[PDB]
């Protein structure tokens, strides 16, 4: 039976005490246990009535269920959403995470597990400090709540509490003998997340607690990420700690100025110049212990500026905004080593800003530097490839020539990224497999858009040879989508999802030029899907044979001339003539179809189901196989 339990769960979710009392009336102990303890499914959440009562803050419901029915405080279920699929949760965890102190009080007084651990080693104290309620955290601590207990990545309650801007709970935890040197997964401490969140009070309380400033696993000290997070207030307080020496504080100031130079929400010129000037003065004040920066060589992408060692050099570029942005980016990746995660975002944003005023060459150069940084960092970069496709389509649509080495470099990075996606999804787990496959398909689509753009533009013979070399490399890699589509099937399918931002105005699938280029690059023609459709079975179903006749005719000509079977069958034994919804494609294929006795004999062999095993050559076996 399930109707009564479902009604009880619904009433507990809605908090109807009268309905719950009516449904639980005249029920035995087994009936009470089944009604209160069955884990119901609703709205993508698998939770108990007590769990959904505590999450919704139904103090009356939870006290009625606990005082009389003495329901056990050891229920399990799926709670929360938006990346929170945490299982094994009790009602106390939900009550603490929902900011309802009364429900927590009732549960704990009824015997809730204060030190309950969920699937990801999560305590109700961590949820309570995540919500930001002082009373819940205090009362749970008063019932022997171990703050040192953390998740599987070693993120204690102090760190996650310091992530948000709540002074009371973090001050109480610091009073509660919390660990200020706790190590996260990548060697991070709570001071790192306090600094990057821009919370001056939490940072000053942590350094009051002798936070033991130290770099993370990557090697970024929390003052560096404070400078990166574009928060001057949290940066300008570690000077009094008397442990920053001189190099650490000065590189913090330089990185803070660099981060102020280029960001989406913290973009300004005047304060950037002020802090850069202050940092340079602090470097060049004493003279005896003067600090000399390790000047990186001028990369051609970042103009032709070899830093500013002299004060007059900095003064001469103070009046120019673009020079300030470029110098800020250079010093930013010099401090960050050009190998950090936070390096690609400013250069990508600056590339977009350069794209704002139709400065397409500078945008392409800056984003190519960004893409090379992402590739050397082994970071997934499908969105960057997508925005290269978008910009290339935009600049084609505005009648402005595309640099052939630029698109060649983007195609090289595209085939490398597709290979990376292949060997990532090769050994991916079930948790992230859907997004891994989606990224693989997106990379394939971006490659197709890039090839379409390369066909749209005209280049010299050597550049075309390089582009065809990259295309042939990807073809030899032999990619496949989730539904068995190769590159040819996508290039001939009108259902291939083209991006709607700017590629939709240029990249139009099916496209004759991309298919011709793929076939010239040795694309396999007779590949099949999971449904058995080849490129011909896909093109013959084209819905626009009249208004777009040139593309359809050219696709059919290229597919036939490159070698394709006009009567090969799919899994449902449908020849491309059968699949051809439009008669125009039927008679185009018939004009391309050539009568062969081999095909007729193979059709007879398949229709009569005569055993052809070992009776024919090895090639003829598969030939009959797909006829």
């Amino acid at each position: 039976m399930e109707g009564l339990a479902g009604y009880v769960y619904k009433a507990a979710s809605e908090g109807k005490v009268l309905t719950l009392a009516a449904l639980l009336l005249n029920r035995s102990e087994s009936d009470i246990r089944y009604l209160l303890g069955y884990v119901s499914q609703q709205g993508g959440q698998r939770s108990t009535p007590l769990i959904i009562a505590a999450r919704n803050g139904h103090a009356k419901v939870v006290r009625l269920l606990l005082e009389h029915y003495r329901v056990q405080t050891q229920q399990t279920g799926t709670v929360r959403f938006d990346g929170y699929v945490i299982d094994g949760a009790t009602a106390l965890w939900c009550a603490a995470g929902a900011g309802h102190f009364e429900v927590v009080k009732l549960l704990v007084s009824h015997g809730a597990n204060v030190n309950h651990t969920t699937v990801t080693n999560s305590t109700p104290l961590r949820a309570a400090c995540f919500d930001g309620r002082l009373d819940i955290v205090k009362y749970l601590v008063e019932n022997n709540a171990n703050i040192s207990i953390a998740n599987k990545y070693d993120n204690t309650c102090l760190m996650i509490a310091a992530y948000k801007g709540h002074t009371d709970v973090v001050r109480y935890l610091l009073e509660q003998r919390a660990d200020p040197n706790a190590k996260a997964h990548c060697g991070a401490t709570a001071l790192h997340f306090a600094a990057e969140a821009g919370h001056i009070d939490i940072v000053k309380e942590l350094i009051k607690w002798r936070a033991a400033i130290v770099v993370n696993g990557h090697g970024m000290t929390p003052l560096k990420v404070a400078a990166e997070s574009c928060k001057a207030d949290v940066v300008e307080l570690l000077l009094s700690h008397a442990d920053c020496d001189r190099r650490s504080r000065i590189e913090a100031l330089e990185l803070l100025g660099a981060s102020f130079a280029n960001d989406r929400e913290n973009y300004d010129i005047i304060k950037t110049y002020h802090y850069l000037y202050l940092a340079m003065l602090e470097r060049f004040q004493d003279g005896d212990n003067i600090l000399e920066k390790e000047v990186l060589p001028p990369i051609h992408a970042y103009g032709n500026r070899t830093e500013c060692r002299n004060p007059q050099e900095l003064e001469s570029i103070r009046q120019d905004r673009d020079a300030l942005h470029m110098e800020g980016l250079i010093v930013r990746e010099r401090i960050l080593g050009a190998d950090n995660i936070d390096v690609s975002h400013p250069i990508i944003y600056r590339g977009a800003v350069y794209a704002d005023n139709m400065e397409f060459e500078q945008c392409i150069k800056l984003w190519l530097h960004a893409l090379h940084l992402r590739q050397k960092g082994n970071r997934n970069t499908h969105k960057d490839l997508l925005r290269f496709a978008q910009v290339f389509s935009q600049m084609i649509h505005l009648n402005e020539t595309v640099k052939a080495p630029d698109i060649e470099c983007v195609l090289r990075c595209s085939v490398l990224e597709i290979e990376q996606s292949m060997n990532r999804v090769k050994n991916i787990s079930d948790a992230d497999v859907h997004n891994a496959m989606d990224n693989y398909e997106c990379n394939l689509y971006t490659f197709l858009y890039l090839v379409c753009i390369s066909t749209k533009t005209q280049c010299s013979e050597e550049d075309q040879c390089k582009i065809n070399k990259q295309i042939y490399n990807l073809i030899h890699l032999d990619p496949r989508t989730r539904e068995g589509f190769t590159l040819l099937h996508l290039a001939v399918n009108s259902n291939t999802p083209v991006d709607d931002f700017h590629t939709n105005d240029v990249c139009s699938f099916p496209n004759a030029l991309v298919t011709k280029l793929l076939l010239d690059c040795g694309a396999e023609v007779n590949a099949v899907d999971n449904e058995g459709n080849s490129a011909l079975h896909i093109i013959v179903q084209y819905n626009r044979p009249i208004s777009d006749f040139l593309t359809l005719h050219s696709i059919i000509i290229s597919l036939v001339e490159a070698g394709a079977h006009t009567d090969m069958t799919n899994k449902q034994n449908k020849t491309p003539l059968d699949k051809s919804t439009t008669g125009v494609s039927e008679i185009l294929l018939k004009t391309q179809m050539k009568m062969s006795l081999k095909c007729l004999a193979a059709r007879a062999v398949r229709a009569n189901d005569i055993n052809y095993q070992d009776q024919i050559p090895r090639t003829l076996e598969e030939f009959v196989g797909f006829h």
Binding site: I86, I160, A352, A355, D356, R387, V391, F501
Partner: peptide
């Protein structure tokens, strides 16, 4: 609509951080 508005923050890194910042 343009690129500059369509650029997002480190949401994928934030999504990767959602594993470590879970309550």
């Amino acid at each position: 609509k343009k690129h500059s508005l369509d650029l997002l923050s480190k949401e994928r890194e934030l999504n990767g951080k959602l594993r470590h910042l879970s309550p």
